[PDB]
């Protein structure tokens, strides 16, 4: 239960590996990773956060 809640509340980006390849593991929007797509002329830059 702590790790379920911590996955949502801890706003930092994590790192993980599969098959000799590395990637970011993300919480909700936090200013890291692919920005949110455009919607009805709302447009989001990379620093967008929830």
């Amino acid at each position: 239960f702590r790790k379920v809640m911590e996955a949502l509340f801890d706003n930092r980006t994590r790192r993980a590996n599969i098959r000799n390849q590395a990637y970011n593991v993300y919480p909700l929007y936090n200013g890291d990773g692919v920005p949110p797509p455009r919607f009805k002329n709302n447009v989001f830059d990379e620093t967008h956060s929830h």
Binding site: F1, V4, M5, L8, V34, P37, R38
Partner: protein, 50 residues
Amino acid sequence: FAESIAIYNEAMDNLIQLLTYPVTVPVEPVVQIGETTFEEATELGVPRGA
């Protein structure tokens, strides 16, 4: 302590079943748009590509 432990256990089950799901790996789509335009025809020339 089975009384208070059952209260704690239920509250966490309710949260977990609303906050969590078994993973899957969708291909996440990028909305970028390429387009073609028609052109007005002439009796000797030819139109542009796509």
